[PDB]
């Protein structure tokens, strides 16, 4: 049986737009049926990076196992529960992608995040995260204390260091993804504008799919 994304896109599904709650957990699929211009995509406006590349990989995946890799409950020094926007509604209330976390400052301070995760699963791990490009300097301090920030992500086969490009929603968000090979580790470091991973996907079944 196919995976029939409805008005949801691959990005919407994989990031977990609250509009895509039908696909919070998805059984094994044969192939994927996506629409041409799906209504429910990126919650918050922006770009999903290497989208075509990822869609291509999906043509070889038949099922994901979603795991929790950074518990929301483990952000001691950052606010992890008020990162919501009326662009991403759930039951008509401000929400956000379910698989990632919009970290905001706690008590006018955003300590440097230096987090790291070793893939002790026996399979390839698909990991998505993001960076927020804010409107203005005011928005920038209101959300993160630090006016000059960066996103830093790295594996054996990845080196990302991004600086947010500041200039219903007038800011943007970039999303990114990588595949973490078994026994490799991923390292996150940021002092603002970081959309952290909460859930990730083990690539559990392969063989032939396709996007339609």
């Amino acid at each position, epitope marked *: 049986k196919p995976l029939i994304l409805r008005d949801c896109s691959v990005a919407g599904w994989l990031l977990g737009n609250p509009m895509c709650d039908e696909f*919070i957990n998805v*059984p094994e699929w044969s192939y994927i049926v996506e629409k041409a211009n799906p209504a429910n995509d990126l919650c918050y406006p922006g770009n999903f990076n290497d989208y075509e590349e990822l869609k291509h990989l999906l043509s070889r995946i038949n099922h994901f*196992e979603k*795991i*929790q890799i950074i518990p929301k409950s483990s952000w001691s020094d950052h606010e992890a529960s008020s990162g919501v926007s009326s662009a991403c509604p*759930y039951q008509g209330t401000p929400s956000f992608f379910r698989n990632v976390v919009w970290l905001i400052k706690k008590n006018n301070t955003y300590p440097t995040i230096k987090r790291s995760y070793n893939n002790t699963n026996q399979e390839d791990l698909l990991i998505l995260w993001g960076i927020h490009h804010s409107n203005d300097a005011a928005e920038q301090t209101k959300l993160y204390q630090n006016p000059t920030t960066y996103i830093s992500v790295g594996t054996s086969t990845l080196n990302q260091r991004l600086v947010p490009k500041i200039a219903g929603q007038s800011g943007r968000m970039d999303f990114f993804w990588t595949i973490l090979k078994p026994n490799d580790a991923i390292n996150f470091e940021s002092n603002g504008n970081f959309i952290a991973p909460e859930y990730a996907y*083990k690539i559990v*079944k392969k063989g032939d799919s396709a996007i339609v």
Partner: antibody
Amino acid sequence: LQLQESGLGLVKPSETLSLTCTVSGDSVSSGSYYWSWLRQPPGKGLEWIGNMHGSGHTNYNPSLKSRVTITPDTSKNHFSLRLSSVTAADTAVYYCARALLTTVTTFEYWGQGTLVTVSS
Amino acid sequence: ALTQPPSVSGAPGQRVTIPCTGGSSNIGAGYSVHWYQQLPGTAPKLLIYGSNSRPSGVPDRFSGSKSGTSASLAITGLRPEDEADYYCQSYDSSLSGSQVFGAGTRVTVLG
């Protein structure tokens, strides 16, 4: 956060078993969690009944899918289990739980248990 | 179904292992194996989930591993208050999918 099961203790065969879970703190709205029923028959062994998400999307155990219904009561901080056409096989201690959205679902917080005997 | 032994035993301070073996459509297929502890009179409690990831309040001594179609819960430094029933859990991809449990293993402490 506390979870508490309740409902009839004795149910006739072929009728509908019914239970509600009463939740306190961060309620069955959210959308960050699964709201689930599990059970434990005589001569133990855990058995999964199903998960429900506040959006009304659900995932049931394939052995019971046709008999199970799990619904929320956002205006009451409840959710309910409804198992129809019960038999002696449905005799068990039933638990409710709040779970992570992992595909191998993570039953983080459990209720206390409530015995249900299907007998006639 | 997952299959575990009905009981294992050890003396306080030593190590005991609880195997949990499945098939090609659950553990062999690559899904995580979670573990739950049930003390005699009470509801179960989450002990290990994912790949050896312990919730707060679970000590270092509890550890899970997994290889092929079989998984394992290890208890080192056995303490008498560990006498409980342990259940392993996983996902099985048959028929739109199911959460799946072992029949439970009772740990007996001998000293």
